């Protein structure tokens, strides 16, 4: 998809110390825009991006009302699922639910998705046609039958194809400065001698947005798949991302090595070399 709106729900039981905790986070692409924490003092859906702050009190009262109802649902589901799996009231368990919609380059509906997990395992998922379900086991099959009889997929599909993409289009326009931006990576290479025989060459990509990026190392233009240390893309904390890739090279052979950076903000893939 070109753009996406996604919500992530987590409910965790803590039998020893009170009621379950529920966390909800909303994203547009790689940018978080809303949060709700059942443990927090506000008891309100809270803004986490400046462009969503423009929304009026009716929006915030509506999101607060809905998120409090989802909080209740997912905290209670823990007890329901514990019973479905014959589990004791002693242990801590997890409920996770993710869903959202993607739009194409034209900002028109492309896909919808919805998945539910219990204790980090798939439980039930909406299929890509937004009309049928996939149940993981015996217990999930009974949820599936219940949702089939109640025509849940019809309501979910109407939300994913309608409401979800209409509000995504609204956010993309209102938050265009933040959301429609491309921050090409700021790239550099560092050299760190390991010994008198070898040196580490580290190819950096900083301050980029969106998170999607490809860093590859080559020796004489041959991909160094096996010998590259590639770190997971990580958040900088300011709404941008970071990534690096490193290779250990024989001292004096640095010139044979090249790093290539591919990113949306780069008109062409970029070649980096060690410049002594």
């Amino acid at each position: 998809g070109s753009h996406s709106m996604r919500y992530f729900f987590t409910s965790v039981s803590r039998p020893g110390r009170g009621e379950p905790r529920f966390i909800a986070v909303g994203y547009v692409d790689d940018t978080q825009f809303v949060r709700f924490d059942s443990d927090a003092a506000s008891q309100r859906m809270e803004p986490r991006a400046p462009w969503i702050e423009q929304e009026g009190p009716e929006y915030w009262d509506g999101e607060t009302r809905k998120v409090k109802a989802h909080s209740q649902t997912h905290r209670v589901d823990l007890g329901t699922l514990r019973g479905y799996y014959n589990q004791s009231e002693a242990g801590s368990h997890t409920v996770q639910r993710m869903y959202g919609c993607d739009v194409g380059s034209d900002w028109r509906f492309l896909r919808g998705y919805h998945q539910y997990a219990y204790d980090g395992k798939d439980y039930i998922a909406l299929k890509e046609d937004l009309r049928s379900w996939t149940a993981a086991d015996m217990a999930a099959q009974t949820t599936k039958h219940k949702w089939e009889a109640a025509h849940v997929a019809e309501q979910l599909r109407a939300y994913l194809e309608g409401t979800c993409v209409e509000w995504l289009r609204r956010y993309l326009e209102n938050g265009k400065e933040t959301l429609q931006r491309t921050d090409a990576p700021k790239t550099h290479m560092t050299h760190h001698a390991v010994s008198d025989h070898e040196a580490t060459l580290r190819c950096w990509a900083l301050s980029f947005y969106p998170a999607e990026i490809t860093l590859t190392w080559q020796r004489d233009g041959e991909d160094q798949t096996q010998d590259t240390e590639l770190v997971e893309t990580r958040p900088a904390g300011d709404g941008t991302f970071q990534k690096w890739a490193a290779v250990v090279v024989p001292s004096g052979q640095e010139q044979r090595y090249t790093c290539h950076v591919q990113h949306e903000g780069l008109p062409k893939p970029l070649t980096l070399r060690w410049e002594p």
Binding site: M5, Y7, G26, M45, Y59, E63, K66, V67, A69, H70, Q72, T73, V76, D77, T80, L81, R97, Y99, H114, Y116, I124, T143, W147, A150, V152, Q155, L156, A158, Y159, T163, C164, W167
Partner: peptide, 17 residues
């Protein structure tokens, strides 16, 4: 913009609204 609980599907037993 969030879906309502009935749009997502209620896994468990009915609870007072």
């Amino acid at each position: 913009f969030l879906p309502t609980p009935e749009e997502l599907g209620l896994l468990g037993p009915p609870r007072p609204q």
